Write a protein that binds this ligand. Sequence first.
Ligand SMILES: *[C@@H]1O[C@H](CO)[C@@H](O[C@@H]2O[C@H](CO)[C@@H](O[C@@H]3O[C@H](CO)[C@@H](O)[C@H](O[C@H]4O[C@H](CO)[C@@H](O)[C@H](O)[C@@H]4O)[C@@H]3O)[C@H](O)[C@H]2NC(C)=O)[C@H](O)[C@H]1NC(C)=O
Ligand SMILES: *[C@@H]1O[C@H](CO)[C@@H](O[C@@H]2O[C@H](CO)[C@@H](O[C@@H]3O[C@H](CO)[C@@H](O)[C@H](O[C@H]4O[C@H](CO)[C@@H](O)[C@H](O)[C@@H]4O)[C@@H]3O)[C@H](O)[C@H]2NC(C)=O)[C@H](O)[C@H]1NC(C)=O
Ligand SMILES: *[C@@H]1O[C@H](CO)[C@@H](O[C@@H]2O[C@H](CO)[C@@H](O)[C@H](O)[C@H]2NC(C)=O)[C@H](O)[C@H]1NC(C)=O
Ligand SMILES: *[C@@H]1O[C@H](CO)[C@@H](O[C@@H]2O[C@H](CO)[C@@H](O)[C@H](O)[C@H]2NC(C)=O)[C@H](O)[C@H]1NC(C)=O
Ligand SMILES: *[C@@H]1O[C@H](CO)[C@@H](O[C@@H]2O[C@H](CO)[C@@H](O)[C@H](O)[C@H]2NC(C)=O)[C@H](O)[C@H]1NC(C)=O
Ligand SMILES: [Mg+2]
Ligand SMILES: [Mg+2]
Ligand SMILES: [Mg+2]
Ligand SMILES: [Mg+2]
Ligand SMILES: [Mg+2]
Ligand SMILES: [Mg+2]
Lengths: 141, 141, 141, 139, 139, 139, 163, 165, 163, 165, 163, 165
Amino acid sequence: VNPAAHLTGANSSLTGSGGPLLWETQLGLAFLRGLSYHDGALVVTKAGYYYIYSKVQLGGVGCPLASTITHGLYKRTPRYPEELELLVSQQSPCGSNWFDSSFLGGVVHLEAGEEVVVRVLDERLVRLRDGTRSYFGAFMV
Amino acid sequence: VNPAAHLTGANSSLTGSGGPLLWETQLGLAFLRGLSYHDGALVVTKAGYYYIYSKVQLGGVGCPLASTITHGLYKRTPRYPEELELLVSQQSPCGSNWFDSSFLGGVVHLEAGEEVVVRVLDERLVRLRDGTRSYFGAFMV
Amino acid sequence: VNPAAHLTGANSSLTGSGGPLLWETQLGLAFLRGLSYHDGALVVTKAGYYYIYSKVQLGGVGCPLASTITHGLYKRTPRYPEELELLVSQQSPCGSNWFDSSFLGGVVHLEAGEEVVVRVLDERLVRLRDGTRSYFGAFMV
Amino acid sequence: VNPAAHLTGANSSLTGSGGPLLWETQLGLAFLRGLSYHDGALVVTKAGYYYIYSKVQLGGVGCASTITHGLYKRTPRYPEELELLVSQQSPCGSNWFDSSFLGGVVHLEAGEEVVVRVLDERLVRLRDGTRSYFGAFMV
Amino acid sequence: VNPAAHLTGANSSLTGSGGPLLWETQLGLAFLRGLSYHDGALVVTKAGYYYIYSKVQLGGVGCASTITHGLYKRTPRYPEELELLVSQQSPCGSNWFDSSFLGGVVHLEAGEEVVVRVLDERLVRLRDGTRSYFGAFMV
Amino acid sequence: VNPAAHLTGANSSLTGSGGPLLWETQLGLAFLRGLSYHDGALVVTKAGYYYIYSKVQLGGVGCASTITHGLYKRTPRYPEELELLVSQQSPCGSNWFDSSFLGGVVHLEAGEEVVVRVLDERLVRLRDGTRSYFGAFMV
Amino acid sequence: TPTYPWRDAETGERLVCAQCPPGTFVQRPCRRDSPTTCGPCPPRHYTQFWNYLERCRYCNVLCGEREEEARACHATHNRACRCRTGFFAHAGFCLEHASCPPGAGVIAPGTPSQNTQCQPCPPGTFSASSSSSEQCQPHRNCTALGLALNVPGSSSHDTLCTS
Amino acid sequence: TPTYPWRDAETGERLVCAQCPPGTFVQRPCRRDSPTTCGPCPPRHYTQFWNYLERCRYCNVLCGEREEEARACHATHNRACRCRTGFFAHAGFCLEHASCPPGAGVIAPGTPSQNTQCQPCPPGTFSASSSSSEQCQPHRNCTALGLALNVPGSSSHDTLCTSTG
Amino acid sequence: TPTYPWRDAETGERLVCAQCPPGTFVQRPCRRDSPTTCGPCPPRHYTQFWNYLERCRYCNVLCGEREEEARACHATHNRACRCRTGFFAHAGFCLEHASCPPGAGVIAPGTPSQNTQCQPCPPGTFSASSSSSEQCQPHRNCTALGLALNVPGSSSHDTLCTS
Amino acid sequence: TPTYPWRDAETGERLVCAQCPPGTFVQRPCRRDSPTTCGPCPPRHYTQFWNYLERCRYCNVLCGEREEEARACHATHNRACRCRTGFFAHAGFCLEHASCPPGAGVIAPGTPSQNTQCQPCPPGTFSASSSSSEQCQPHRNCTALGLALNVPGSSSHDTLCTSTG
Amino acid sequence: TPTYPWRDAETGERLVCAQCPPGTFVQRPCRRDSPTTCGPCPPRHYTQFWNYLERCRYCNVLCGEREEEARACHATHNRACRCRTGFFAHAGFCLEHASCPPGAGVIAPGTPSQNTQCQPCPPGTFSASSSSSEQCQPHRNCTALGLALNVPGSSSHDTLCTS
Amino acid sequence: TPTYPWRDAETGERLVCAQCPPGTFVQRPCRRDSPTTCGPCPPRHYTQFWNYLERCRYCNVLCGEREEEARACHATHNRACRCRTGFFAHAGFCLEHASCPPGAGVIAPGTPSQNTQCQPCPPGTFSASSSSSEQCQPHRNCTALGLALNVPGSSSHDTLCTSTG
Ligand SMILES: *[C@@H]1O[C@H](CO)[C@@H](O[C@@H]2O[C@H](CO)[C@@H](O[C@@H]3O[C@H](CO)[C@@H](O)[C@H](O[C@H]4O[C@H](CO)[C@@H](O)[C@H](O)[C@@H]4O)[C@@H]3O)[C@H](O)[C@H]2NC(C)=O)[C@H](O)[C@H]1NC(C)=O
Ligand SMILES: *[C@@H]1O[C@H](CO)[C@@H](O[C@@H]2O[C@H](CO)[C@@H](O[C@@H]3O[C@H](CO)[C@@H](O)[C@H](O[C@H]4O[C@H](CO)[C@@H](O)[C@H](O)[C@@H]4O)[C@@H]3O)[C@H](O)[C@H]2NC(C)=O)[C@H](O)[C@H]1NC(C)=O
Ligand SMILES: *[C@@H]1O[C@H](CO)[C@@H](O[C@@H]2O[C@H](CO)[C@@H](O)[C@H](O)[C@H]2NC(C)=O)[C@H](O)[C@H]1NC(C)=O
Ligand SMILES: *[C@@H]1O[C@H](CO)[C@@H](O[C@@H]2O[C@H](CO)[C@@H](O)[C@H](O)[C@H]2NC(C)=O)[C@H](O)[C@H]1NC(C)=O
Ligand SMILES: *[C@@H]1O[C@H](CO)[C@@H](O[C@@H]2O[C@H](CO)[C@@H](O)[C@H](O)[C@H]2NC(C)=O)[C@H](O)[C@H]1NC(C)=O
Ligand SMILES: [Mg+2]
Ligand SMILES: [Mg+2]
Ligand SMILES: [Mg+2]
Ligand SMILES: [Mg+2]
Ligand SMILES: [Mg+2]
Ligand SMILES: [Mg+2]
């Protein structure tokens, strides 16, 4: 059984806490197969190389100049008390109302017990609609 | 044999019918291995989790305010007479002449007989060049 | 052992030569497993279908009208004295200062001895930060 | 003695009421010579052709987003204002400034009044009596 | 009796021909006092220095994208127009308005004519004779 | 004989020094009648109320990004300029043009001088003496 | 019948004359003896309200290529303009009515004051065309026809059925 | 009543099973001797058509802070959203209803689908405020009031009369 | 004490009068016999420098809703304005002080001339709030508390520790 | 003649095989006793150089509605596109040739690579139309015609003469 | 030789005088007895056409820092300007000639009226430099040199060959 | 001193091993009888906290042409960048320090974090140049110099006096 997961945007996705986004893990298109989840982090149970990915749908009305949106995938390990940046985009997409989408994919090595989370600063620009526009997944390669 | 496919932009890609895009399936870089194709839909013959993906290259001259472009991957099942949205971006990329590209990837579970198609509204903003800029693929994970 | 690799943006990434980008292959997040590397090209040692991908982080101050940025993945074979385009985006993202990110993924068949490289024209718009924002990888499917 | 006048932007110039702008008439560069003033209007007392003029300085941040600046006549013979000279500008096209100038010759009778309006008044920026003003002279 | 005039935008003002603009000379705020008019030109009959002026209201949707508005003299002594006072504006920077005002004193002889041109004329928006006009008075 | 003047943009008009603009006073459309000139200033010799005016043509490529165009008085009774009439424009909102016009009546005594300034001067575009100019007449 | 003050031009006592009604103006002011004389507005002129004008106001309003007279010049009113069929009024301009792209349909048609209003076609409905009149229609019901499903429908394509 | 093919697991005979109606899904397929068992859609799920799903589609639609439920998740229909009062729908966003400035008035109040509609105040009427509900109202009529005209009105300020005539 | 030229209004010889000091103007010019007479500036007027004005300059400067008097009108100077607390001066406008978004903190507070300055929170530090005062603080040190690490911190969230 | 290494499958000897020329590909590799068999590129494919492909590169280039074939797919070259008449190429798009407004005239007509070129009408010439082919033409010369000047010309309107002198 | 009407300044009969040719103006109008007297244009002035001006037109045109005289002032024409080498005329401005980025080459050089024209380098060709003169050159032909292929070329890099 | 669990490989006893301090990493885990062996971080790597990495984190931070090293890669800290002289930091870019135009002067010079600060020249002062260091300076005072005023000054040009009085 090769591990895989795809987590979707949900009603509680945007905590506003400065923490990572939360996701649906069971309903509609969301699923975990050989991965676990905890407070928005995917939790690795099988060591190996994973392609991780995330898309977030952004949008707003005008810019506040703070007009750069970062979207990123970050690793947590219990051996070091800080997160490690893995894959990150900066967009300034507001160049009235606007929509843009940010995608991230790549392969990283992950040990059992390590976790990956998704952060967007500023969180308020993420637009949830139906679970198909913002999401977070991975599978082992 | 692990299923995979990569279908490319082609001369007949844009039908204008409101239907899904069509693609090349045999020539140049296009290929099917353990997947089939029918009227623009990839057709699953082996049940499992697939990472599906699509990129479309967009472009134009100015905006018509109708200035939001949706790009999405949609599932068809014979058990329900409507399509299910899987993965979707909204871009308003025209913020004289412009180019933008939209990527979508993610994992979904697909049964044999189910199909996946790619829709862009509005279709007229997709720019074909050579099969390398708009495309649609998948492989099992 | 299934081949995989993920190469990161590095100090020497932008040669200015008109050649392909260079990448880190050993340090931090960069790795090769059953793929080799040479002068910015990933070098295939095992024939098969690969999902290849690349992200480059772009940015600048205003546009020079030359204001279209191409990002692409290109194949080299020893049987033909020219490169083959595989996957390509055009962005005109500067529509003061701006940031945009371009992602590319897709599956291609590669023989042993073939190579894949990443080109951005114009190279000067790529912004390196820390190896997490511009990158190039692949794995066999 | 040829009637003439120049009124300047003042602290009380924007009443926020939908009415005309008010102005300074006495201090600094403001003056009246053979014309009178009343709650924002030049009041004519010698009939004749007058070149009238006004300039308003406009400004804001971002963007209903069209601005009219106009000179308008009142006569007590008719219960509505008459438009004399008018501009529409949409200059919000972060910070912005733009100036609007109007001048033209009109015939005015003793008792008729001229005033200045801007919609939206909110966009007028006063600084010192030199950027927004209103005046006239007989020709 | 000091020559003066104010002509207003009219229904027939844009001929589409490359020629000058035409104007109303008699009705509403339009008038002629010691000046004449002819196929769009003020015609001088008393020699002197004149303040001349014109304002055109401009507008459109989106964007060759530069607009000239100018006042020009004709004399029968020379087979080409002379430029007197001119502006270039590129205000298309969806909907937009902008106004252009020109005024200045020039010396005119009996028989000389002044006219107004805008390129591209297409961008002039008439509304009511108050936003586009053309006038003069001797000084 | 009623004082009047119209000075035109000239080759030497932008000194780059922070000082006022210079102008042509004699050739083409430029003239002086009962006014004098001196290193860019109209110099008054007959006291009175004057309508003064100026128009500058502005232009550039892209974008400190606010432009002031103003008319200013000098009197030898006080060691600083007085601002009379002023506009701020930020029209850079690739190529762009915009014109600024100022007119107004002020009282001037014999010996007082008026000048024109633009900051940043760099943005003034001369072409032919018709797009940037400076003048006055007594009223 | 309202009134205005007037001095007699030679006697100089305050008289109180009657104003003239809409559609008219003061041809000749009142005097010692006779009431105010009111003439009717010449063509191309008006007075909408009671007044003491010595000359009617000019019908000064002009309609552009994309406008028609919503009210003609009349003795008692100026002309007014509205947009022609096909255009609507936005910021003092007559813009063309919008089309609703595929996957979206018309809920309210365009009018002289309002643009075409659109929406995404809800589930079970479609529109396959850019159009400024075509609305969200419901999918063909394969079951209510005694037919089996061929290809499912979407917001921009009708559901298909087989023989 | 539409059908889906099946096969008895014991014998192997082809079966023609009945589909399930809106509000249900196939919980058990038909057999030679019992019909298809249709289950009711559980909370947060739905089926809106005749169908043979082994599970109901999820009510996936989320409503933002500026939206409320036009329709609830129900067994026969997904949830659906419209804009709250104060807001209207432009291009997938919920924007604030514009105010008409001074000199202009509301001809149609804004709705969930539609923005405030303003014309400029016609002659003899006015609006002095920025408002998203104030309409062009008619000028104080001094002649109808028997009073003397003090200052005439405009599109943005009411006519003023004296207190006598 | 500087001076200016004057003709006597009836005799017409060049006299050399004294100017008037800041805060004053020439009520009456000098003559044959008497020195220049200098009056003080009326209210709302000024003269900042030595002069021979027949009327003080008017305090012409106006402060807007978002400005306060940095200097009042005075006999010797015009009024001047600066931005109120909360705003700073950018292009002759008083804009609101910026907030630093999560993942970034305040290094220099806003003032009347300068906007809030921000930066990304460096390693080992955080800010979990949009704020125009809140700065980059250091992560909770789990080890310097005799506690084990629960969840690691980031530029926008504090590190957590367990019992 | 360039070469690629190979190996006889029966014996095992190294071979030095010949490459195939433009317009062909390797259909069969060389052997000890027969040379490399070069096949002609099949329709819709090409090879433009000396090469040892086992299959020809595909003619992948597509021409939009605003383009036509500058070159056809041929066995020695991919297809290639230029803009149709009426259009020129800016930044991968095919834009419409600008018109020169009134007061300005064409100095160079637009091509597939280049947009219309306009100057403003020099003295003694004019253009009265927006056109993408009308050049600045010289004013009616009333003195050359022996006629009296009626109205002088400008950069955008022709001089007018009377019908006599 | 065309003509103009004139009244004699004291007799007042219509005379028919000759105009003056380009490069000249009317120093003195014709009379009873003598033909029109034509003076030549002073410096800095002109008359391009036949005329009866009492003063030549002023050479009023000014060339800017990025312009040179395409025609000097002359008795019979005004000055005219074109762009200096390095710039071209776009909307009444002299912009700098463009560079063609790597992967694209020059087909037409810049001139005073036209910008540098570029294109993607077609197959078998390259340009490795941003430049406003450097064109698409063909790849090194490894086969036409008796060498084997090292690394293939692209639109922005030359093909490499080995010993 | 913080700890991580472990297990002797011979016996199987649980161990409570010591973590490694900033500047080190775990090279060998603890055993029943020897403590954890902490290795020094090799060049180009670091650990900034107490930790149990089997390898140090890489100094991944790169400095652009417009940046210099605010901090070097060190065993206890990653590298870090600030803008070079002439430049300041806005939104992840290093922009050039603005010049104040004529009529305005520097109140604060620009730093790596902050752009040039300009006010307009207050009365009795001036600046005649675009400069990123020139401050509003006071006008030549003709009365303090005993000289006659020639031309008054402005915010952008100095007052001029004659050479006598
Ligand atoms: C050239 O040099 C001369 C010196 O020989 C110089 O004259 C001085 O000008 C200053 C500024 O106008 C004067 O300072 C003022 O003095 C009076 C008292 O005498 C004060 O009341 C003034 O007001 C202050 O008050 C406010 C409180 O409400 C404060 O907030 C504010 O700080 C005000 O400044 C002020 O101090 C000074 O009196 C004269 N000096 C003499 C000797 O006359 C002149 O200004 C210089 N000229 C130029 C053009 O630079
Ligand atoms: C109507 O037709 C008449 C012809 O009957 C025509 O008159 C001609 O005008 C041209 C242009 O003004 C004249 O050409 C000039 O001739 C003189 C010598 O006589 C030259 O010096 C002139 O200058 C050139 O010199 C420069 C060198 O420094 C050159 O760089 C430049 O090319 C200049 O042109 C010029 O050639 C010509 O003399 C008259 N012809 C006659 C017979 O009088 C008139 O212009 C036409 N009118 C209209 C309105 O089109
Ligand atoms: C398609 O058509 C059939 C009519 O044959 C509809 O069947 C009814 O659907 C409703 C929906 O709630 C059910 O309550 C009824 O039980 C259905 N039919 C019968 C026989 O009772 C079906 O709803 C239609 N689908 C639509 C309108 O989307
Ligand atoms: C967290 O707290 C502990 C204090 O208990 C710090 O421990 C010191 O870290 C420095 C950093 O160079 C070392 O040199 C010392 O060896 C440490 N402690 C001892 C016992 O010697 C630790 O640095 C703190 N972490 C921070 C400030 O990030
Ligand atoms: C590279 O060089 C060789 C010359 O040695 C060229 O060889 C000729 O290519 C043409 C192309 O149609 C063929 O018809 C000829 O058969 C070739 N050579 C011989 C020996 O006949 C080759 O075309 C060159 N490649 C280019 C210009 O791209
Ligand atoms: Mg539709
Ligand atoms: Mg209102
Ligand atoms: Mg913060
Ligand atoms: Mg033309
Ligand atoms: Mg090049
Ligand atoms: Mg300075």
